Design a protein around this ligand. Structure first.
Ligand SMILES: Nc1cncnc1Cl
Ligand SMILES: Nc1cncnc1Cl
Length: 165
């Protein structure tokens, strides 16, 4: 009933930076929220712990979750390699939005992005399923390590992750 909260403990070239927590809109997008939750806890045997934010573009987004190929071309969901676009009820309204990366319709896996700007052109193309709750300052710090082309100047990892409450 209460939307779940998950956390990511971020590191920069292995040095602790801080924690980002997320509210998952399980009330609106339960299937997509459950995937992210489960990958954050690692309860299926695979997930985000130890993965990186491979593409960070200041003024746009931080993308991560590719734990199979480490570069944006991989990832898998708890439902199989890919799963459908659940719905598009929620919109990309500004910094802090959590949304699924994809490679075409109905291609959600594990990759996700955190918006650091309003990205309204993604509405109806990418499934929004959560938002940063605490630690937007940490996101902003991460963002500083990105670049126009998205390559990071230091390696930005999820040192630990899981569920709160
Ligand atoms: N391609 C596919 C097959 N079964 C479930 N979901 C998807 Cl996206
Ligand atoms: N799986 C994947 C492959 N290429 C680009 N984006 C994604 Cl999410």
């Amino acid at each position: 009933m209460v939307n779940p909260t998950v956390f990511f403990d971020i590191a920069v070239d292995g040095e602790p930076l801080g924690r980002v927590s997320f509210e998952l809109f399980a009330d609106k997008v339960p299937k997509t929220a459950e995937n992210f939750r489960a990958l954050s806890t690692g309860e299926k045997g695979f997930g985000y712990k130890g993965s990186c934010f491979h593409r960070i573009i200041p003024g746009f987004m931080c993308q991560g979750g590719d734990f199979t190929r480490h570069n944006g071309t991989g990832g898998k969901s708890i439902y199989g390699e890919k799963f459908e676009d659940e719905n598009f009820i929620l919109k990309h309204t500004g910094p802090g939005i959590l949304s699924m990366a994809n490679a075409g319709p109905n291609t959600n896996g594990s990759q996700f992005f955190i918006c650091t700007a309003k990205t309204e052109w993604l509405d109806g193309k990418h499934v929004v399923f959560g938002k940063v709750k605490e630690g937007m300052n940490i996101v902003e710090a991460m963002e500083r390590f990105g670049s126009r082309n998205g390559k990071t100047s230091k390696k930005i990892t999820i040192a630990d992750c899981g569920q709160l409450e």
